[PDB]
Design a protein around this ligand. Structure first.
Ligand code: DGT
Ligand code: CA
Ligand code: CA
Ligand code: CA
Length: 341
DNA sequence: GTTGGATGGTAGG
DNA sequence: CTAACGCTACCATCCAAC
């Protein structure tokens, strides 16, 4: 069984680099402008030139302009990026019809049926890597191993524009010495509530009885982490089904004025239904982001699917339900649809 | 004594 | 306006309703 994994390199930035190659070789930042004030919003990504100086997805745009004033700052055009993602995901279908899209910029292939061993799997990476670069001028990073998780770790090890094979043998080696915070699924919170025990390697979980870990990071995470170390984890490439669609926007000013919020919430509803096209949801949730950036929400699941008009009415009640029970002023407002028929 | 809905925690692109 | 986007998926915890 062989999984080959692909993740494009600083995607949104790279795409923009492709459309304006003069940018190439100098710092580039792609931003999500909120509209609150000039430069309000966060970074969605930045090229490696920009990263040297501290500019990465997630930081406030002011921190970045502060820290890297003379760089290109471009507005995010997700839609344009999605075409390029789509056209690349089509190529990956050439090499394998068993493909799992994981994000806008990555995907796993099952190539157990195309190649015979890691050596040929490696050669395939080179072809896959070269087709994309010929038909889209986009470099990408390939990881190759015995399953999703390790194929993803190998990719992370080789970024950017790399290619790494993790063999039955080197898997032994990492399960033993790979830091625990570098395992997919393990973030700050956990990998700090892990050093709590003395677990530092994927291997150190085998050294603490189930019981203790179970009630420290939860049933699903424990079962998962242990089967990795014990080396029995095996999830198949499965086609993912979008399970929810949403929209959330930031308001010019914080409000508790229902009449002032409503327009924003209605904006969020129109663009979700467009975004739904055809799919019928039975569930709605209004999501509010508050002054202090706590995220609060109220939902409702219906017996039968929710029409656009039903959603206008329902969301409003839910907003009120939120206004009734949170004292804080609202800063961002949004909506999410789910439980699709 | 499941389950499954409501709200939130955590991770990640 | 005076910093912290916008998405999504999976899981944990609670409590009613069966
Ligand atoms: N709005 C927004 N978009 C993000 C965020 N993180 C990632 N993205 C988008 C923009 C990225 O180009 C794209 C791919 O993200 P990746 O996690 O794979 O990193 P990226 O490709 O940008 O650089 P690379 O993988 O790290 O070396 O997803 C984020 O926090 N916010
Ligand atoms: Ca990625
Ligand atoms: Ca990437
Ligand atoms: Ca981590």
């Amino acid at each position: 069984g062989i999984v080959l994994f692909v993740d494009f390199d600083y995607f949104y930035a790279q795409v923009e680099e492709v459309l304006n190659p003069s940018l190439k070789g100098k710092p580039v930042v792609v931003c999500v402008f909120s509209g609150r004030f000039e430069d309000s919003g966060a970074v969605a990504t930045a090229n490696y030139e920009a990263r040297k100086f501290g500019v990465k997805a997630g930081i406030p745009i002011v921190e970045a302009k502060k820290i890297l004033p003379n760089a290109v700052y471009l507005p995010m055009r997700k839609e344009v990026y999605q075409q390029v993602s789509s056209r690349i995901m089509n190529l990956l279908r050439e090499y394998s019809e068993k493909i799992e899209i994981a994000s806008i910029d990555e995907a796993y292939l099952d190539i157990s049926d195309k190649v015979r061993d890691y050596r040929e799997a490696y050669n395939l990476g080179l072809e896959i890597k070269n087709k994309i670069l010929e038909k889209e001028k986009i470099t990408v990073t390939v990881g190759i191993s015995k399953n999703k998780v390790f194929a993803k770790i190998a990719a992370d090890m080789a970024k950017p524009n790399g290619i790494k094979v993790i063999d039955d043998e080197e898997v032994k080696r990492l399960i033993r010495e790979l830091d625990i915070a570098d395992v997919p699924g393990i973030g700050n919170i956990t990998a700090e509530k892990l050093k709590k025990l003395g677990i530092n390697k994927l291997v150190d979980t085998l050294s603490i009885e189930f019981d203790k870990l179970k009630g420290m990071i939860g049933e699903a995470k424990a079962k998962y982490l242990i089967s990795l170390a014990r080396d029995e984890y095996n999830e198949p490439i499965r086609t993912r089904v979008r399970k929810s669609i949403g929209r959330i926007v930031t308001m010019k000013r914080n409000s508790r004025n229902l009449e002032e919020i409503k327009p924003y919430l209605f904006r969020a509803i129109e663009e979700s239904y467009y975004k739904l096209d055809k799919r019928i949801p039975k569930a709605i949730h209004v999501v509010a982001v508050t002054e202090d950036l706590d995220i609060v929400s109220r939902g409702r699941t219906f017996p039968h699917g929710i029409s656009k008009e039903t959603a206008y009415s329902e969301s409003v009640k839910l907003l009120q339900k939120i206004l009734e029970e949170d004292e804080r002023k609202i800063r961002r407002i949004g909506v999410r649809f789910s439980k699709f028929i």
